[PDB]
Design a protein around this ligand. Structure first.
Ligand SMILES: Cc1cc(Br)c([O-])c(-c2nc3cc(C(N)=[NH2+])ccc3[nH]2)c1
Ligand SMILES: [Ca+2]
Length: 223
């Protein structure tokens, strides 16, 4: 997260860190046994770390559970990143409480101007890699579709939305992929891509979760 602030330990209880011997992506806990992340974060050998704040120190509240299966959306296209969503079932249910809790899925899509909270342990530099030890937060508004399409002509599908600042300086970045974009207490986006990080006129692009709610519910139901 570039231009963000330290969230404060366990202030984002649904945030998860996907770990394969190092933190590589974020994710959101939607129920005690399932996490939603981005399909481009897929890999085998994933350990889900819940209740985390400092990813390099065990401080208490952490729960490490291995993933039982990861279901990448069947229509995920790695060249366009259309349908960039993935579900991970945990080997055992997490214990929920106030430090580890699920986030609700939306009932409607959000409109441009809605302010959201994006969080993650991704890069905090737009020029260079500086990964933090504690969770960073950023408040960003969803942008209108014309500003999003004028920024990435021909690369935005109806399953994506832009959120951020066209003046640059504040944005999500590598390491934040798979993480949550929460607006009014609902998970509305998943950190997906962008050109560079916090660059002028190049906002972050997020998976539009309201378009996948029936899919998420049907898939969790049949698995
Ligand atoms: C080289 C590389 C590899 C991976 Br894997 C990424 O997810 C990314 C990446 N760039 C990103 C840029 C943004 C942004 N909001 N500007 C968000 C996620 C990103 N993820 C970059
Ligand atoms: Ca820790």
């Amino acid at each position: 997260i570039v231009g963000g602030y330290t969230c404060g330990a366990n202030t984002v209880p649904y945030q998860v860190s996907l770990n394969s011997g190092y933190h590589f992506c974020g994710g959101s806990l939607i129920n005690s046994q399932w996490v939603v992340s981005a399909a481009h974060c897929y890999k085998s050998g994933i350990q889900v770390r819940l209740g985390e704040d400092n990813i390099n120190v065990v401080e208490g509240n952490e729960q490490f559970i291995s993933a039982s299966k990861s279901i990448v959306h069947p229509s995920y296209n790695s060249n366009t990143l259309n349908n960039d969503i993935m579900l991970i079932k945990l080997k055992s249910a997490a214990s929920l409480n106030s430090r580890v809790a699920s986030i609700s899925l939306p009932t409607s899509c959000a409109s441009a101007g809605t302010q959201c909270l994006i969080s993650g342990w991704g890069n905090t530099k737009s020029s260079g890699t500086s990964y933090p030890d504690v969770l960073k937060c950023l408040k960003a508004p969803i942008l209108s579709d014309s500003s999003c399409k004028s920024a990435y002509p021909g690369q935005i599908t109806s399953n994506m939305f832009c959120a951020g600042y066209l003046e640059g300086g504040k944005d999500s970045c590598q390491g934040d992929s798979g993480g949550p974009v929460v607006c009014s207490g609902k998970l509305q986006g998943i950190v997906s891509w962008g050109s560079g990080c916090a660059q002028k006129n190049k906002p972050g692009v997020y998976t539009k979760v309201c378009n996948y709610v029936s899919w998420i519910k049907q898939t969790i139901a049949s698995n």
